[PDB]
Amino acid sequence: RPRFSFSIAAREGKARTGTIEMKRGVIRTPAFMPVGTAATVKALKPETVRATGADIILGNTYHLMLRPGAERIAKLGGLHSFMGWDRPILTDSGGYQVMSLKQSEEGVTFMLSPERSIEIQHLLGSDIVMAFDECTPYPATPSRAASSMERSMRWAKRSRDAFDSRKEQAENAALFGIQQGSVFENLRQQSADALAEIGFDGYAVGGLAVGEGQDEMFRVLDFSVPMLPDDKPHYLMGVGKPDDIVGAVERGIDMFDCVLPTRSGRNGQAFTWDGPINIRNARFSEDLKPLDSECHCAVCQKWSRAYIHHLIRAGEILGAMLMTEHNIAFYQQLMQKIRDSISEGRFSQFAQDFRARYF
């Protein structure tokens, strides 16, 4: 297996399905990445994450640097060893926290800079390294957006140099750049242009899912994703709801991460093919059906809504475990159905069917 390869097996319009080959394994695209910010996918064993179908998971530079520390994890053998996941791991750079949570051209003191970010991600043993950026807040005036975008592009250049400066990293991991530019077409193009001239193994669409509404997110995607090199993966960061994912794949996105399936699970929100449900609602107190009647996950093969209703209302940890396993399995099943319909040339129909049923 090589450091990094991306092969497209099939297309339908802008939608693509294929595979990313990396040393630690293969990634089926379009791909959903469960998030596991504290060196765990919340409430789940990595075996369980894998069993649900995930090919890769996401970790985070900002949180791990704080606890337990990147150096400490390095000393303990790296993130894979530490949390017991031997498959690829993508780590975010901290660029979202730069928005989510004293800044200057050098970096941000919470101290994270392009160089420190890339080093921390090296200490973790990340397989896919994200460039250190600034997620531009929304709304933003064209001026702010531009100035923000330009700094990230300078930061993307330093991230590259930093990555390239470390042999073990350069030879064994991959580096993705992140496009900014808010909702502005010319800024997005300038950003894509800068990123491609620098050169990355993959390209993320950053700066969305920051409060703009799905309509506006899809508009921006319409013009932004074709700006990215067609022959590399396209990652839409932090997205999203099932319908967000479907619409984004329709516009050229290959990769996703989102806290929804895990967070929603713990909160008692379950995704179904008929739409999301709040299992705490009293209508489910004696519902013997599974969370979803077609879902193939172990939860839905064994436990009833009624049981998981009680668990969640009682604040039982098993409730969190079961909801989370189902939600992530659901998300992976969605990704499988998307992959299959694109391979078979019926993704357009699937997407319509799905929306008709989901909504």
Contact status: 41 vs ligand 0EX (CB under 6 A): no
- Cβ at position 338, least distance to its own copies in Å: 29
Pairing assessment for the beta strands 5-12 and 15-22 based on DSSP bridges: antiparallel
- 257 belongs to the catalytic site: yes
Residues 314-333 that bind Zn ion (CB under 5 A): 326
27 SS3 class: strand
Token pair for 131: 């460039």
- Dist. CA 163–CA 173, nearest whole Å: 9
Contact status: 154 vs its own copies (CB under 8 A): no
Contact status: 40 vs its own copies (CB under 8 A): yes
- Dist. CA 59–CA 208, nearest whole Å: 19
Q: Which does 235 bind (CB under 5 to 8 A by kind): its own copies, Zn ion, ligand 0EX, none?
A: none
Contact status: 130 vs ligand 0EX (CB under 6 A): yes
Sequence length of the chain is 359
- Let me know the angle formed at the C-alpha of 291 by 287 and 297, rounded to the nearest 5 degrees: 140
Residues 257-296 that bind Zn ion (CB under 5 A): 295
- Dist. CA 28–CA 261, nearest whole Å: 19
For the window 47-76, what string marks contact with its own copies as x by the rule CB under 8 A? --------------------xx---x--xx
Contact status: 242 vs ligand 0EX (CB under 6 A): no
Stretch that binds ligand 0EX, among 15-23, 66-74, 203-211, 242-250 (CB under 6 A): 203-211
Which is nearer to its own copies, 97 or 189 (by Cβ)? 97
- 92 belongs to the catalytic site: yes
Catalytic residue among 92, 127, 254, 292: 92
In sequence order, what are the residues at sequence separation of 6 or more whose Cβ sits closer than 8 angstroms to the Cβ of residue 173? 3, 122, 126, 127, 128, 129, 163
259 SS3 class: coil
Residues 157-176 that bind its own copies (CB under 8 A): none
CB neighbour class for 103 (10 Å; exposed up to 12, middle 13-18, buried from 19): exposed
- Cβ at position 94, least distance to ligand 0EX in Å: 7
- Enumerate the β-bridge partners of residue 278: 269
152 is in an annotated binding site: no
Stretch that binds its own copies, among 149-157, 228-236, 275-283, 285-293 (CB under 8 A): 285-293
- Cβ at position 75, least distance to its own copies in Å: 6
Q: In the set 22, 49, 258, 297, which binds Zn ion (CB under 5 A)?
A: 297
Residue 277 · residue 270 · CB < 8 Å: yes
Could you tell me how far CA 45 lies from the centroid of its own chain? Answer: 19
Could you tell me how far CA 14 lies from the centroid of its own chain? Answer: 20
For residue 65, give the nearest of 128, 132, 133, 121 by alpha carbon: 121
- Dist. CA 55–CA 46, nearest whole Å: 11
Q: In the set 177, 206, 233, 290, which binds ligand 0EX (CB under 6 A)?
A: 206
339 SS3 class: helix
CB neighbour class for 280 (10 Å; exposed up to 12, middle 13-18, buried from 19): middle
Q: Which does 176 bind (CB under 5 to 8 A by kind): ligand 0EX, its own copies, Zn ion, none?
A: none
Could you tell me how far CA 180 lies from the centroid of its own chain? Answer: 16
Count residues binding its own copies (CB under 8 A). 33
- Cβ at position 244, least distance to ligand 0EX in Å: 10
Catalytic residue among 127, 201, 244, 257: 257
Stretch that binds its own copies, among 19-27, 192-200, 212-220, 280-288 (CB under 8 A): 280-288
- Binding footprint of Zn ion on the chain (CB under 5 A): 295, 297, 299-300, 326
Binding residues for substrate: 92-96, 133, 180, 207
- Binding footprint of ligand 0EX on the chain (CB under 6 A): 35, 37, 58, 60, 92-93, 95-96, 130, 133, 135, 178, 206-210, 237-238, 257, 259
Active site residues: 92, 257
Binding residues for Zn(2+): 295, 297, 300, 326
